[PDB]
Amino acid sequence: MLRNKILAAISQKIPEEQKINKYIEGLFQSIDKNHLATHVAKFTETNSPGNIGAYDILSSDMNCGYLDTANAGWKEPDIVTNDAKYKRPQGFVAMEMSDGRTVMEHLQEDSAELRHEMEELTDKYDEIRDGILNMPSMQPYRTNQFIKQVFFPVGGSYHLLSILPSTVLNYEVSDRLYRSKIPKIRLRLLSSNAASTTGSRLVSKNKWPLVFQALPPKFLEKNLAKALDKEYLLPDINIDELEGVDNGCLIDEALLPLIIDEGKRKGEGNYRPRHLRDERKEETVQAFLDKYGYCNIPVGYEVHHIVPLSQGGADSIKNMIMLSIEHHERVTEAHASYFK
Amino acid sequence: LKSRPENLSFARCLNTTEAKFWQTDFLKRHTFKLPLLITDKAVLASKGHEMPPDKLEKEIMDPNPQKSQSCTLSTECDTLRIDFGIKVLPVKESMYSCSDYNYRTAIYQKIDEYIAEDGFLTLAKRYVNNIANARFLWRNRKGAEIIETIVTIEDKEYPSFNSKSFNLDTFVEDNATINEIAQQIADTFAGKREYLNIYVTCFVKIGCAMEVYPSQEMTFDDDDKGKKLFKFEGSAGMHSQKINNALRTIDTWYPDYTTYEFPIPVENYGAARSIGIPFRPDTKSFYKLIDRMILKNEDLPIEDKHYVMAILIRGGMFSKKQEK
Amino acid sequence: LKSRPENLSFARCLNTTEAKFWQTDFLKRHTFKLPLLITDKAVLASKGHEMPPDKLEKEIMDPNPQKSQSCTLSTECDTLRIDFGIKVLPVKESMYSCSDYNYRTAIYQKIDEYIAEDGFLTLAKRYVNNIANARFLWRNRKGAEIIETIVTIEDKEYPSFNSKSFNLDTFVEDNATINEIAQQIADTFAGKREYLNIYVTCFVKIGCAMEVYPSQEMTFDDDDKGKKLFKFEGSAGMHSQKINNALRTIDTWYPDYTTYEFPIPVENYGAARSIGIPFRPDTKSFYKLIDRMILKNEDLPIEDKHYVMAILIRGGMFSKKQE
Amino acid sequence: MMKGYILLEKVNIENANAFNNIIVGIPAITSFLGFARALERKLNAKEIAIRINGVGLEFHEYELKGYKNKRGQYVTSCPLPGSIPGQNEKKLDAHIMNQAYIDLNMSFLLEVEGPHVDMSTCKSIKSTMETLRIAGGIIRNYKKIRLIDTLADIPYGYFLTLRQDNLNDAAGDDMLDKMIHALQQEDTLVPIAVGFKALSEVGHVEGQRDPEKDHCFVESIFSLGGFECSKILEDINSCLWRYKTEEGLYLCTII
């Protein structure tokens, strides 16, 4: 019944025998182009020229505290070609016969039942089986601008590292998470044509994988309230580093435009009501004269916060500077005129 | 020198953050602001799309349930507020990868010749002009009553603008604030500084309970094709690449400019996603222009140098054609 | 010009906002207003739907619990107040996306020809007529004693209307306030202005503790089962597109109009769900009409120009299947 | 040659690369270590002559670029692709590759070695810090830079610590089954890429970014991790990620 599947795989106006022969010609022409791999390139970017893979077949350490390829329970190596034109054998390897068995199990075991179809339809089956059983592996020759390259410090020097993905590990993760209860992320964004042009067969079979979710705990997500409350405001100008501050005594009148500009440009659009407003406590004021070396408030001088408390000011030591009895009124009137 | 290096890669010299949307009243725009939220919406429409005659005669009068999202003002505010920021980085230090060495030396020498010749003032003026006329509002600019834009650099507050008076087609090179800001931008592009930080706040008056248009996200899902709007920490906003596209719409030097007469953004081939036809197909593309600038070392008119520097400001992957 | 552009699209030139519901008294309607909230409700009905006889023989007398919502006036307020607004934008500066430049130039030329020919007066008059007769009340129009509607532009408050006297089948052209407002609307549509803002407030008298009918939300299979009403800022209200469907019920130029003799909302294919009969299937469809206006450059009667401009006011996705 | 600690407090990063081979979410620790090494190189180009020993990460806020589904899962977004170099440069619409982006509000604890470490180093690091990207994400703002010694002056947050013991003693025939069983029985651990394998022989290759360095292919390896509060930390040296190179291994470890 394989002849019906072969005829269905061809969509043309030619008769039955020519529709059969096109499949055989395509197979006989495209055996040599295809290869087998586990870490093929062109998965992170379809524009990478050529075919680059690794085909790592090693032992499972099972004692190291990490995960890689030939360390998980993957069983099927990936089949990848260089061009989507030579993709016919990658669909030929996934064909269903009478009962529930793929053509691999009849292929490397030399089952005669499959041999009936491939010896009655045509006579090239032995060479095709020889070509597809022992199959050329990858050597990751050359690199392009699309493969990610990074620098890693090795001792006193640096090493250039070229990163390649893992198709088989991705497929295994996809199915294992499919039959599980882990949160997971689907991540369906790959088109069918892009998956076809990637060149492999696992991505064609599974274009939308299943991905581990690696996120911080649930109470760390940004939401409306966390951005809404935020925190109080402090000036970017430190009193001790300015000229004419007299350790807490403004003298020069040229600082007044700077003070009112710093008050206006920082408190703009940050009004909050008295319910959300900060409280001007007494120990924060007193600690200022304690640190600066004063026992009591100087005569003719008052405490004025550079950032207004009505516009989200902070009740911290770094928020006010003492000013003259007149300049306090001037700053207050200017701020009242600007806001209200 | 024969060709471009196998691995050449720059960065973006004008980084922009994601905008945020706030609503307030115009008379009290300098005091308080309120959050703007995005609501869901369901509609029942008809089959208005074009159909083949059999499908049309079958489904002519069927209902159509659809899902969408919408953002709108309240009944007590009539002003939308947008706050964001820009970071400017030097061009010479913006190159991230160059496999060849002589090509890097030639690039540095040509950039030195350009800064000694002009000094990045023209592109800075054009960028601050695209800032001043509020081109980044996109669909929010239509139907506006008053558009006010202010610019803050470090700790100095520049006088406010008025984007309504500015034309969206010409360019102004005599505004004092424009030249003052463009001087700092050209200095930061030059390399005299090390970075620049600009803070932009825009007020637009559209009326009470009107509609705003935040960025629409690109998503793929099963059994859900509705419109999804960009939420930024709960509030609405705009994508960084949406704002960056509006800023770099300064290219008025493409062929047949005197016919169409509108500026376009700067791409490698001069292609904008509103005409469907590239304005610089083969003979004015960036690749051959930078080939003739570097490999042949042939001098070019100042317009081509402006276009090449504008491409270099945006950044990309200007490597040679890769081989297998 | 051989075909339509592959990315042709339009915006809408009549932006309508959500309505809000208030309740007050008719003798004090200029002094105070009160919010109108939506209340939950649960009912115990009977299995009254049509059933096969086998099920009918076994569960004819079963109860049926159901959930719903209702919005009614209080016992001391008899007047329903509806507030909303419209923003008007120029037609020429509303074409969102288009690939071919020649198509844009042709569209601009045809729009300029229509502006110089008619001046957007007919459609503006019909829109302010649909505003005047209070078609947007929908089910709230039935059984009302006094319905009044005022229109405010900037600060000029125009004299009140009386929508009861206005028939819902004919369009008048001689009202002073209607023509005065339609003049500004036509000027904004043509491009002589750049934007217009109009605010509409409607008072409906129905009686104490009566029922109002806000818009009903649409729910899918995954959502909870039951009737859900539309809430806007806590109070009840109406959808923007529900109001916009009533405003654009101006199409009286379809074929077989004399047989039925009533306007229909301006649709692409002329479909009307009130009577369930399509009215512009093939010949007078918008797709076929605009293919003769632009591609063939064939002049049309003024009725087709009216319908085409009315469609272009609404806007939509007039794309093409990649020719 | 004094050794202290430098805290970069409350750095906001947007559009950081949140994708791996089979991991979506928290970026690889190699990105943060590379950011630290790039900062060290940029400082040493300014004649500061100091080196970084260990990096500690403190997560405060995070957000995934996308939206939560009605059922509860996340669906991610992506920017509209521009002009991909190579074939179809002139095409108006380009192909779409797998990508994910994240938003972080994170603090960094750094251990330094060098002469006269004082506030001048803080001023220099403030001047030179606003020029780099964290895992490909642009830095929007930052609270401050502080010089600290003990664990008392530490803001509230959660540190990422390597926990390979839970992965080791899990039940399962192979490593992936052990990982999924450990994640099944414990709902707090998360999988993070930690380093790189080799699967290749070193040498010189054509087309590299810099054709002078030793080139070798790699593959990201994945392990487990967890979160714990600041006050629960015993010693300040326990949460300090550092490099570890071996014959064919390029990993990062908490030890």
PDB file of N, CA and C in Angstrom, chain A residues 100-126:
ATOM      1  N   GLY A 100       1.810  -0.552  13.046  1.00  0.00           N
ATOM      2  CA  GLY A 100       2.431   0.581  13.705  1.00  0.00           C
ATOM      3  C   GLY A 100       3.937   0.485  13.841  1.00  0.00           C
ATOM      4  N   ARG A 101       4.650   0.709  12.738  1.00  0.00           N
ATOM      5  CA  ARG A 101       6.107   0.705  12.746  1.00  0.00           C
ATOM      6  C   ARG A 101       6.613   1.596  11.623  1.00  0.00           C
ATOM      7  N   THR A 102       7.584   2.448  11.939  1.00  0.00           N
ATOM      8  CA  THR A 102       8.204   3.305  10.944  1.00  0.00           C
ATOM      9  C   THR A 102       9.172   2.500  10.079  1.00  0.00           C
ATOM     10  N   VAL A 103       9.633   3.127   8.992  1.00  0.00           N
ATOM     11  CA  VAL A 103      10.460   2.416   8.018  1.00  0.00           C
ATOM     12  C   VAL A 103      11.898   2.221   8.468  1.00  0.00           C
ATOM     13  N   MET A 104      12.325   2.861   9.562  1.00  0.00           N
ATOM     14  CA  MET A 104      13.641   2.558  10.122  1.00  0.00           C
ATOM     15  C   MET A 104      13.707   1.119  10.622  1.00  0.00           C
ATOM     16  N   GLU A 105      12.707   0.705  11.404  1.00  0.00           N
ATOM     17  CA  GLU A 105      12.708  -0.628  11.995  1.00  0.00           C
ATOM     18  C   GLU A 105      12.628  -1.730  10.945  1.00  0.00           C
ATOM     19  N   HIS A 106      12.042  -1.448   9.784  1.00  0.00           N
ATOM     20  CA  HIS A 106      12.137  -2.347   8.644  1.00  0.00           C
ATOM     21  C   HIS A 106      13.369  -2.078   7.792  1.00  0.00           C
ATOM     22  N   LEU A 107      14.096  -0.997   8.069  1.00  0.00           N
ATOM     23  CA  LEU A 107      15.177  -0.537   7.204  1.00  0.00           C
ATOM     24  C   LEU A 107      16.527  -1.097   7.646  1.00  0.00           C
ATOM     25  N   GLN A 108      16.943  -0.811   8.883  1.00  0.00           N
ATOM     26  CA  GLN A 108      18.235  -1.344   9.309  1.00  0.00           C
ATOM     27  C   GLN A 108      18.157  -2.800   9.749  1.00  0.00           C
ATOM     28  N   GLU A 109      16.959  -3.335   9.967  1.00  0.00           N
ATOM     29  CA  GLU A 109      16.787  -4.752  10.254  1.00  0.00           C
ATOM     30  C   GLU A 109      16.589  -5.584   8.995  1.00  0.00           C
ATOM     31  N   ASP A 110      16.571  -4.943   7.821  1.00  0.00           N
ATOM     32  CA  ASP A 110      16.453  -5.613   6.523  1.00  0.00           C
ATOM     33  C   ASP A 110      15.192  -6.474   6.445  1.00  0.00           C
ATOM     34  N   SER A 111      14.075  -5.908   6.894  1.00  0.00           N
ATOM     35  CA  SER A 111      12.801  -6.611   6.823  1.00  0.00           C
ATOM     36  C   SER A 111      12.373  -6.768   5.369  1.00  0.00           C
ATOM     37  N   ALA A 112      11.999  -7.994   4.995  1.00  0.00           N
ATOM     38  CA  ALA A 112      11.652  -8.274   3.609  1.00  0.00           C
ATOM     39  C   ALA A 112      10.319  -7.662   3.201  1.00  0.00           C
ATOM     40  N   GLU A 113       9.437  -7.372   4.159  1.00  0.00           N
ATOM     41  CA  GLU A 113       8.135  -6.803   3.823  1.00  0.00           C
ATOM     42  C   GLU A 113       8.279  -5.429   3.180  1.00  0.00           C
ATOM     43  N   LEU A 114       9.189  -4.604   3.702  1.00  0.00           N
ATOM     44  CA  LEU A 114       9.507  -3.332   3.058  1.00  0.00           C
ATOM     45  C   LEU A 114      10.197  -3.567   1.716  1.00  0.00           C
ATOM     46  N   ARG A 115      11.023  -4.619   1.651  1.00  0.00           N
ATOM     47  CA  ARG A 115      11.727  -4.970   0.424  1.00  0.00           C
ATOM     48  C   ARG A 115      10.768  -5.344  -0.698  1.00  0.00           C
ATOM     49  N   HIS A 116       9.589  -5.884  -0.366  1.00  0.00           N
ATOM     50  CA  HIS A 116       8.571  -6.116  -1.391  1.00  0.00           C
ATOM     51  C   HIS A 116       8.223  -4.828  -2.127  1.00  0.00           C
ATOM     52  N   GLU A 117       7.911  -3.764  -1.384  1.00  0.00           N
ATOM     53  CA  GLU A 117       7.521  -2.511  -2.022  1.00  0.00           C
ATOM     54  C   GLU A 117       8.688  -1.881  -2.773  1.00  0.00           C
ATOM     55  N   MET A 118       9.861  -1.801  -2.139  1.00  0.00           N
ATOM     56  CA  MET A 118      10.971  -1.143  -2.826  1.00  0.00           C
ATOM     57  C   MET A 118      11.691  -2.031  -3.836  1.00  0.00           C
ATOM     58  N   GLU A 119      11.257  -3.278  -4.035  1.00  0.00           N
ATOM     59  CA  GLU A 119      11.747  -4.074  -5.148  1.00  0.00           C
ATOM     60  C   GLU A 119      10.698  -4.318  -6.220  1.00  0.00           C
ATOM     61  N   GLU A 120       9.419  -4.089  -5.920  1.00  0.00           N
ATOM     62  CA  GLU A 120       8.382  -4.158  -6.939  1.00  0.00           C
ATOM     63  C   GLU A 120       8.154  -2.812  -7.614  1.00  0.00           C
ATOM     64  N   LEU A 121       8.258  -1.712  -6.861  1.00  0.00           N
ATOM     65  CA  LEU A 121       8.081  -0.395  -7.465  1.00  0.00           C
ATOM     66  C   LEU A 121       9.237  -0.058  -8.401  1.00  0.00           C
ATOM     67  N   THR A 122      10.464  -0.351  -7.983  1.00  0.00           N
ATOM     68  CA  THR A 122      11.655  -0.105  -8.786  1.00  0.00           C
ATOM     69  C   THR A 122      12.744  -1.053  -8.299  1.00  0.00           C
ATOM     70  N   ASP A 123      13.913  -0.988  -8.943  1.00  0.00           N
ATOM     71  CA  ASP A 123      15.074  -1.770  -8.513  1.00  0.00           C
ATOM     72  C   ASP A 123      16.251  -0.816  -8.327  1.00  0.00           C
ATOM     73  N   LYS A 124      16.269  -0.139  -7.178  1.00  0.00           N
ATOM     74  CA  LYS A 124      17.436   0.601  -6.719  1.00  0.00           C
ATOM     75  C   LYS A 124      17.572   0.530  -5.203  1.00  0.00           C
ATOM     76  N   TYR A 125      16.808  -0.345  -4.542  1.00  0.00           N
ATOM     77  CA  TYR A 125      16.604  -0.244  -3.099  1.00  0.00           C
ATOM     78  C   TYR A 125      17.876  -0.548  -2.318  1.00  0.00           C
ATOM     79  N   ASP A 126      18.705  -1.469  -2.816  1.00  0.00           N
ATOM     80  CA  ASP A 126      19.917  -1.843  -2.091  1.00  0.00           C
ATOM     81  C   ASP A 126      20.893  -0.676  -1.994  1.00  0.00           C
TER      82      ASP A 126
END
